[PDB]
Amino acid sequence: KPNPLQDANLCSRVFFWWLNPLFKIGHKRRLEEDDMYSVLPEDRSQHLGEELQGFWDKEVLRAENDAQKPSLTRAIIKCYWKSYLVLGIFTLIEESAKVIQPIFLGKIINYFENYDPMDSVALNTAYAYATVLTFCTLILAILHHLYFYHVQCAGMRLRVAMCHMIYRKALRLSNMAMGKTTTGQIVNLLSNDVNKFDQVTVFLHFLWAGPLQAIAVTALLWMEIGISCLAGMAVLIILLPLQSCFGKLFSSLRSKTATFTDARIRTMNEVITGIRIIKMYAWEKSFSNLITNLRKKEISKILRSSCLRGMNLASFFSASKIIVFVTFTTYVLLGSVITASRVFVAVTLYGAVRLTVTLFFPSAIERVSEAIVSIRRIQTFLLLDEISQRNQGLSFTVRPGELLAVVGPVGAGKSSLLSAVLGELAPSHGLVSVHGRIAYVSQQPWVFSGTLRSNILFGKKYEKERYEKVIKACALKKDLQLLEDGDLTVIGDRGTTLSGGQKARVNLARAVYQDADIYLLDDPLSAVDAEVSRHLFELCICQILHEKITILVTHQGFQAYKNYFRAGAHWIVFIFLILLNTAAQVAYVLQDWWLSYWANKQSMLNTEKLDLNWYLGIYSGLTVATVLFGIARSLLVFYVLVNSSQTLHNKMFESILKAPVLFFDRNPIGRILNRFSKDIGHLDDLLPLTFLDFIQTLLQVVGVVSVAVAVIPWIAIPLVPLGIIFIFLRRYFLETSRDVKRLESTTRSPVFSHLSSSLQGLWTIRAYKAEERCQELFDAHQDLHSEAWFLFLTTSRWFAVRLDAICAMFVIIVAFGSLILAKTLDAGQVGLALSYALTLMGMFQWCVRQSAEVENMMISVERVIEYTDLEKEAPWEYQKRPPPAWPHEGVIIFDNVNFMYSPGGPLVLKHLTALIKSQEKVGIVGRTGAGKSSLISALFRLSEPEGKIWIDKILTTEIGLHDLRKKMSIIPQEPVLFTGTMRKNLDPFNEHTDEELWNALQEVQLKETIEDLPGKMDTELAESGSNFSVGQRQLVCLARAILRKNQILIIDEATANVDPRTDELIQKKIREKFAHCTVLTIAHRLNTIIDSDKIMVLDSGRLKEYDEPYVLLQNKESLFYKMVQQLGKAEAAALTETAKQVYFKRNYP
Ligand SMILES: CC(C)CCC[C@@H](C)[C@H]1CC[C@H]2[C@@H]3CC=C4C[C@@H](OC(=O)CCC(=O)O)CC[C@]4(C)[C@H]3CC[C@]12C
């Protein structure tokens, strides 16, 4: 993949003319990894890493010789100073041009001030000054992009070399070092701490170009207006601590909102995870109340932070107005007069120095601080003790052809012995002599990123016959056939596409194919079956390894915007907001126009004087109006958008609380929580800020264009082509930038994956001498990502060059049409128009970038609105409320009941017809998934069933959901305890008394177990009772059932893996607590339901038998007797005897 940048001229490199085919291809179709350009030889990972490693080694040697600490910063400087000096030269030139061009602007205005229609030498000099101004504009607009690309490439090179050296160090760390650190510390310092180097170089040269530019601008201002510049300079200086305090207060406000956002997200996770149980118990109202309280508490602080951010933006908007106001107020109060040549030179110089002071210097300070911190961290990492290069009283030897075996309990030291053999255990005393290639198998299987064939090869050359022999010996044919691509299938991190046995088999195959002199195996057959383990142990060891040293360890659009804005406030508020923004921009421009009018009226004079009171009063009024309107616009925009976010969140949460269980079955929990964690997070604190910034910048651009058009009406003619070209160019760019932005995102993850895999299997990597091959693989992975970072930089520069070309064409048109039509213009108009044209720079590009960011961020709004209108089940309440004691008896009649999880899916129940008399015990038996689990769903109307179900001669489908689910108790398979007090977990609605709760706890025998915590019952618990036992949770649910005290009770899978003592306790309490309540039990074991009055028999969703268990046991052809006989003989006899005893005791007293 040749890189056309290698064969480009200087003219083709300044304008990025070599990137056109890529944009054409991206416009035609989509871009893949085959469409990228290979990196230049000077940008390869190995080259940069080796250079920086040599410099760092020299620095470390010098520091050790001089007996002091080494400096990674000093090494980096000594490496990159030569290449970073020339960028300093060009930034010096750029800042010089920025400072210089106001002088020629003022000279053009001065020509306009002494207009003589007959003189031509003055006109020629004015044309020359305009030409020099255009040259400065072209220097600032054209070459800056190549300069910026080189500046960013320097930081990219620094980051790549950093990553290479970090990986090289991490590949040889000692065991004590690995014990001190973790596998996450190495990953994070390369995933987030090395990215500071991409941004440190952009602002690195402003630390000396900020103060110098400020001093030069102050000197020029003193030359122009005099001592009056000190007021503007004082305001500009004061602007820095104000911003520092704003930041220090916003951070404090945000750290207080985070503590509520986290609690809200945790509660959301809990309710989403336990949605079936919450719907079963009808507690959605309580959870809604809790979430509403938390959301309101978070929203208050979000409102405070939004107000602070709006004030910050208003201050940024009106700072220039305030500076110019104070400067010229003192200028005219000291006794001088106002002229257009000086006013609009001071304005331009103040604008330049204001951008420099308020943005570039603080950004440089912050990024340099972060970079220094990161360099300190990396220097700390690069100095841990490393393994020395190979130059109780264990003493044994092993010869080739000997299958040594070690058998012992866990913790004996077999793994430690193998590590000592490999050299991992440092010999405190004794001597270990190991010579030759060593093959090692770790206890835990390890598979690195790549394919199965690549994993087996481990970098070795592929051989067909050897690979086939190894595969056949390892019995991997079935595992290969299990995959789609066979042996070429890509295995993900931790083998997500395979199993543990498959990973172990692949590792064994790789070890065998490596063909080492010494073979070491650790726990090979523990995680696999019997036949495969025997086949391995025989035909891959006793024959293959019979000639090798062996040691073995064995154990055997537009609607989106419309809805987003309509959710915020009524359309009248939108009209008022539009008017407010328009008035703010109008006043902002009218202040400058008033300065121009003052200059013109002073010039057209005569001694007569000007009304200072009048002019200064109108000036101050315009400034005050500008400031107030900016503040109002910012506050109103923030309030409206935050209210929109709040309303959207409320509607979405209310809709998802009522969505049926099918929606939660179809969607994963993480996907559900993403729209409450990330999308709402955007809508709450980033979209309003981005929207307000974009609106501000767009209105400023419109104001500049409007001033230019108003001064010279003919400028509206080239504007139509300049806008059409801009629209088409933006479409053309965005058709490829969005494809490039994802390549650099999906190519970054393999680096971290390889890092994690190499860290995990570091012992296996070092067992063989194949570590340079892993270094080369890491180099290739890093090259594949620097291959897309290159395009990310170059396409952005490509777009910026053409945007700057359009802006510079506009500036040139203004500056030359002013002189062409000089017979009708005057100094004030010319100065105003030309100064605004000069300010258009940077503003245009920032507006475009902010528009792109807003369009990117609207996806969260689209997702939130999509979840806002989900499906809704039957309402919780109906018009006809039931009698207060509708559970009179509990007789339940099923008549022609067909139930399916989803419409159009396979059926589960087929024509169920049965009757359940009050106060009887019913057992349910059958196959797993054969309709046993759908009975509770049909009875609780989780999915609306087909047919008629009668409870006390009332139809279930005729009464509301909350008026039905609340009157029948449920005991789930796995009980869940919700976060909160025991009082909350036993009675969320507070419908009972403390004495009743204590009585229930005594009945379930947790009262004594509870009354020893620091709190009586209000102790906070962990997620789903992590500090409690399964039996404890079951008894808590039993206490819930007793407290509810409903006539109908249903148990589903009571005991699965609980201790027999708690099982017997639960069974006896269930039997002796609910004598007068109808109980339906769905049990997977026949011991618990042997004494039931009747047993339901289900066969593939068909009701087969409905009679007494003894009667069914009498018939041998009955399904119940067959399932009994499957259990055994003695247990079957005991169950039959128990059924006979129950039948005799009940029916025949
Ligand atoms: C980005 C910057 C560093 C490059 C732009 C050039 C500048 C270094 C400036 C500084 C002083 C300027 C000069 C100052 C005064 C004049 C006199 C002026 O008037 C004439 O000599 C008459 C011209 C004519 O008759 O056409 C022409 C422009 C010129 C040479 C200027 C040309 C541009 C100069 C060299």
Ligand SMILES: CC(C)CCC[C@@H](C)[C@H]1CC[C@H]2[C@@H]3CC=C4C[C@@H](OC(=O)CCC(=O)O)CC[C@]4(C)[C@H]3CC[C@]12C
């Ligand atoms: C007219 C020109 C030549 C003046 C140049 C400006 C320097 C006198 C100052 C301005 C900003 C300063 C930097 C601001 C921030 C930092 C980070 C800071 O790093 C630390 O050692 C502190 C740890 C941390 O940053 O958390 C101190 C040095 C340094 C590079 C400073 C070095 C001296 C600098 C370049």
Ligand SMILES: CC(C)CCC[C@@H](C)[C@H]1CC[C@H]2[C@@H]3CC=C4C[C@@H](OC(=O)CCC(=O)O)CC[C@]4(C)[C@H]3CC[C@]12C
């Ligand atoms: C885009 C729209 C909806 C914004 C609001 C309307 C503006 C386009 C109007 C409202 C008031 C207008 C101003 C009202 C009066 C004048 C005086 C006028 O002064 C002169 O040049 C003549 C001298 C004189 O007025 O005696 C210049 C235009 C200006 C500033 C107008 C500029 C255009 C303004 C700001």
Ligand SMILES: CC(C)CCC[C@@H](C)[C@H]1CC[C@H]2[C@@H]3CC=C4C[C@@H](OC(=O)CCC(=O)O)CC[C@]4(C)[C@H]3CC[C@]12C
């Ligand atoms: C002459 C200039 C100042 C324009 C006049 C416009 C004002 C009449 C409007 C425009 C912006 C409005 C403000 C926009 C945003 C806010 C924040 C908003 O939220 C809060 O302060 C919290 C309210 C709560 O928590 O209930 C309350 C209304 C308020 C002050 C508005 C009050 C009325 C304002 C100042």
Ligand SMILES: CC(C)CCC[C@@H](C)[C@H]1CC[C@H]2[C@@H]3CC=C4C[C@@H](O)CC[C@]4(C)[C@H]3CC[C@]12C
């Ligand atoms: C006196 C009138 C005629 C104008 C004379 C031009 C003078 C003032 C110009 C010419 C060269 C200019 C300097 C060129 C280079 C730089 C370095 C830059 O980082 C800050 C601005 C600064 C320091 C400029 C300040 C202004 C400057 C000294």
Ligand SMILES: CC(C)CCC[C@@H](C)[C@H]1CC[C@H]2[C@@H]3CC=C4C[C@@H](O)CC[C@]4(C)[C@H]3CC[C@]12C
């Ligand atoms: C506050 C913004 C939104 C709009 C109001 C702008 C006001 C403050 C400005 C803009 C245009 C100005 C007017 C422009 C021209 C003249 C003609 C002169 O013989 C008397 C003053 C008068 C009439 C000015 C008074 C102040 C003025 C009305």
Ligand SMILES: CC(C)CCC[C@@H](C)[C@H]1CC[C@H]2[C@@H]3CC=C4C[C@@H](O)CC[C@]4(C)[C@H]3CC[C@]12C
């Ligand atoms: C951003 C949008 C919504 C509103 C911005 C409108 C502003 C920037 C425009 C609209 C009308 C314009 C004015 C129209 C007419 C003149 C007279 C001319 O001799 C000097 C400029 C001046 C005074 C213009 C200054 C800029 C102006 C006030």
